Amino acid sequence: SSSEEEKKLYARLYESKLSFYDLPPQGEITLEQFEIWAIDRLKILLEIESCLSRNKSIKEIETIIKPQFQKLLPFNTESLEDRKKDYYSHFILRLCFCRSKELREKFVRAETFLFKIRFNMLTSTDQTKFVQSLQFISNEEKAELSHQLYQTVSASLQFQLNLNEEHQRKQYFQQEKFIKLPFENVIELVGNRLVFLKDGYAYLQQLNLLSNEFASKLNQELIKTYQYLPRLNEDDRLLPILNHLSSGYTDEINAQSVWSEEISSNYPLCIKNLMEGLKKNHHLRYYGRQQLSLFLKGIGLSADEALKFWSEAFTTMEKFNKEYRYSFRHNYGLEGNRINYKPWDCHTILSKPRPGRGDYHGCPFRDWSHERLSAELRSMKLTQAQIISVLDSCQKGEYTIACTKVFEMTHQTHIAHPNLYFERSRQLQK
Amino acid sequence: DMEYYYKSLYPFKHIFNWLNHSPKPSRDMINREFAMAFYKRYNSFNSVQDFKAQIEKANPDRFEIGAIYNKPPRERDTLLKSELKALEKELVFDIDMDDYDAFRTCCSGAQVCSKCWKFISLAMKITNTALREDFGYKDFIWVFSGRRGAHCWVSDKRARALTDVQRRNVLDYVNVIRDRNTDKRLALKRPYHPHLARSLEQLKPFFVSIMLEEQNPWEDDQHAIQTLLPALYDKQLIDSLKKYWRSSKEKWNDIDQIATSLFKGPKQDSHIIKLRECKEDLVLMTLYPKLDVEVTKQTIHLLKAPFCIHPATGNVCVPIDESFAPEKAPKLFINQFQAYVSSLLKNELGSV
Ligand code: SF4
């Protein structure tokens, strides 16, 4: 087929910015683009699955994945190449994940969630265009049932679109169109009562219905592709790639609470030193920055809350966004190879270079003089015998033993992790 | 007595025609499960004569209607347990007087009368409104349970082919009053669903006439404290009303008067709105249908067949019309069943 025919067929296929993936793609693409596009969509899908397994909120999920859209598979672009990337990537993963039922379930779940997101950032005009591209009710029928439909959908609009004002809800309802469908296809909404039900028909919460239809059609197409796969088993090129891709699958703590006494009372000595140096200097150096950021990640501080806390502690935004935002997001494993970096344990902390002037990282039981450590203990109401005990532990090089002693006197005995210290201190209050 | 009832008085032909959904015998009756209480299950009959003869021979106190299977239930002993799969059964609702006993004073225990039958009648009205205006069902009939309850049999072909998930969703749509305890405020979701608003609007006119005058359950101060007061939202209002405490009407007006006396200032509007919402919630608690959730959930559930004799009172489980009362049920209607069965048959032919 010619280039003009391909362009016309594609423009017909993506008259809306989203597609249902009904007709398989037509054209020739290289093995390079095949593998690259399949890997890109698999990366986005693995990220959605990792977000699911952590029970993250929907909003947090799109916040994480929007840059991955801008990087791997950009959406809402008039470029034909990106649209073909999306289409061929979806069908390549369709080919790859159809071998087993578990793979099919995972694929359809992730793809339907991706559809949910993609419909979410699409605008209301674009959403209407895609939906029009399942019978919509006429204007007279909507006007006749306007009161009941408004009563049914008012709560849903308020809770999903955040239209707290009644006038905004009424304006949205005036423009909102509805689809007449039977309750057998909308039973899940009927049970929760999100759809007005009349004479055996449910008046559509349309995203849930669209996603369910997507899941059903996708599962049927996956089964059909599994039926047709033995014919395509004859090619030497694709089989290793499909096999590789199949095996490739296989707040209480916020920016203001970490500053409070309630949370800081559960910190170890090192984290107190980092926190206090941050407060004094409004800035921390690299090893101290990474140490404190990883500890905060271990205690449950979110990426957004970490960014807010780090921005407010560094009392311009230009240099922050240029130089520290990427580091503070990458500690959380949101870019690069996306390493959810494990917080440093006491061995990792003690393996770092010894701090100098202005450097606050490390272990106070090793880097501080005995006088400063002793004074910090008197500030903790530690008696002289206890101070002598922890100093004896420090003098032998058993800094972790000294920290464990400090924990016991201030509050499985041995603690070799600041996050373990914090968790046990929180448990003692729980 | 039961032998004579099944020999001469029970309408076997009409029940057979209703269950088979066709004048000629078909798999709707050959494969339909029958359970007999004397508890023998998985019985089926090939014709009206076989049905009558087996019922006369076994002589049960009552028998119950099951679902339609792929294979005859009478041959279950020759079939694997996984081979007998349920296909269709009429959608069924069960309402009893038990859940309204905390709100009635005319009868005590298991007794029923026309005065307390208003709760049941309003339950039928609301359920019929839901099924007709919402679900579009047309062929449904209400059958007396024998002592103080009513059974609904929805014979619509769409209702008959419903799966267990669909039946559960339908019940959840209808069963608004999920928590039957009278010591806790319902706190129903706001704003009301159109079905809930419509049900409240229909139940409002009868609320005064039944509860505040004819039943008068809150006239007893202890009864008021146990049921009427927990329906409120404000602890100060509850304490003030308890200290002040009359017939149900006087207490009902005292609620408004004390709320007006206590709640003043710019925030009084929220308080009066909340009080009105609590009053609507209590009206629904008192008057909304309180279905038996178990019988409706699954297709395999067994419900007592129509025209059965209640073992304790001798009342025959006759169909219920608008003017039916527990006293009107004869002791040990056929034409009404004829009209219903005929309408069901013509609707079935129209659907075909
Ligand atoms: S022993 Fe570990 S947790 Fe304690 S102060 Fe030293 S580095 Fe921090």
In the set B1, B3, B28, B33, the catalytic residue is B33
Gap from CA of A350 to ligand 1 centroid (Å): 9
Q: Which residues pair with B175 in a beta bridge?
A: none
Q: Which residues of B touch A197 (CB under 8 A)?
A: 134-135, 173, 195
3-class DSSP state of B333: coil
Around Cβ A316, how many Cβ atoms within 10 Å? 7
Listed residue (A341, A340, A339, A336) closest to A71, CA to CA? A336
User: Does the N-terminal peptide bond of residue A67 adopt cis geometry, omega within 30 degrees of 0?
Assistant: no
Tokens of A178: 């509805």
A to B CB pairs, distance under 8 Å: 50
Gap from CA of A33 to ligand 1 centroid (Å): 50
Chain B residues whose C-beta is within 8 A of a chain A C-beta are: 133-137, 158, 165-166, 168-170, 172-173, 189-195, 197
- Tell me if chain B has a CB within 8 Å of the CB of A183: yes
- The number of the ligand 1 atom at minimal distance from the alpha carbon of A346 is 2
Q: What angle do CA A127, A131, A136 make, to 5 degrees?
A: 125
Closest partner residue to A151 among B134, B166, B194, by Cβ? B194
Question: What are the CA-CA distances from residue B188 to residues A156, A246, B177, B279 (Å)?
Answer: 16, 48, 9, 11
Q: Containing domain of residue B94, as a range?
A: 1-352
In the set B90, B94, B139, B281, the catalytic residue is B94
For ligand 1, is residue A400 a contact (CB within 6 Å)? yes
End-to-end CA distance of chain A: 69
Residue A165 in contact with residue A184, Cβ under 8 Å?
no
**B191 to A191: CB separation less than 8 angstroms, yes or no:** no
- Tell me if chain B has a CB within 8 Å of the CB of A193: yes
Shortest alpha-carbon distance between residue B273 and chain A (Å): 17
3-class DSSP state of B179: coil
Per-residue burial over A342-381, b = 16 or more CB atoms within 10 Å of its CB, e = otherwise? ebbbbeebbebeebeeebbbbbbbbbbeeeebbebbeeee
Closest partner residue to A191 among B173, B193, B195, by Cβ? B173
Shortest alpha-carbon distance between residue B166 and chain A (Å): 6
Residue B140 in contact with residue B125, Cβ under 8 Å?
no
Gap from CA of A361 to ligand 1 centroid (Å): 10
Distance CA(B189)–CA(B248), nearest Å, equals 26
Has B50 been annotated as catalytic? no
Listed residue (A41, A97, A90) closest to A225, CA to CA? A97
Residue B187 in contact with residue B282, Cβ under 8 Å?
no
Listed residue (B322, B121, B147) closest to B202, CA to CA? B121
CA-based nearest residue in chain A for residue B170: A191
Distance CA(B51)–CA(B55), nearest Å, equals 6
Around Cβ B334, how many Cβ atoms within 10 Å? 13
**B173 to A188: CB separation less than 8 angstroms, yes or no:** no
Q: Which residues contact A110 (CB under 8 A, 6 or more apart)?
A: A45, A48, A49, A52
Question: What are the CA-CA distances from residue B36 to residues A147, B20, B308 (Å)?
Answer: 49, 19, 11
Q: Which residues of A touch B169 (CB under 8 A)?
A: 183, 187-188, 190-191
Q: Which residues contact A31 (CB under 8 A, 6 or more apart)?
A: A237, A241
With the most atoms of ligand 1 within 8 angstroms of its CB, the residue from A299, A344, A349 to mutate is: A349
Identify how the structure was determined.
Answer: cryo-EM
Question: What are the CA-CA distances from residue B336 to residues B141, B319, B339, B340, B342 (Å)?
Answer: 10, 8, 5, 6, 10
- Provide the domain count of chain B: 1
Containing B279, the helix (H) or strand (E) segment is: helix B268-287
Residue B151 in contact with residue B145, Cβ under 8 Å?
yes
- Tell me if chain B has a CB within 8 Å of the CB of A146: no
| R_g of chain A, CA atoms, integer Å | 29
For ligand 1, is residue A295 a contact (CB within 6 Å)? no
Listed residue (A96, A92, A104) closest to A246, CA to CA? A96
* Nearest CA, atom 4, ligand 1: A403
In the set B64, B90, B96, B139, the catalytic residue is B96
CA-based nearest residue in chain A for residue B165: A187
**B173 to A199: CB separation less than 8 angstroms, yes or no:** no
**A193 to B197: CB separation less than 8 angstroms, yes or no:** no
For ligand 1, is residue A270 a contact (CB within 6 Å)? yes
Distance CA(A307)–CA(A60), nearest Å, equals 14
CA-based nearest residue in chain B for residue A145: B194
**A187 to B165: CB separation less than 8 angstroms, yes or no:** yes
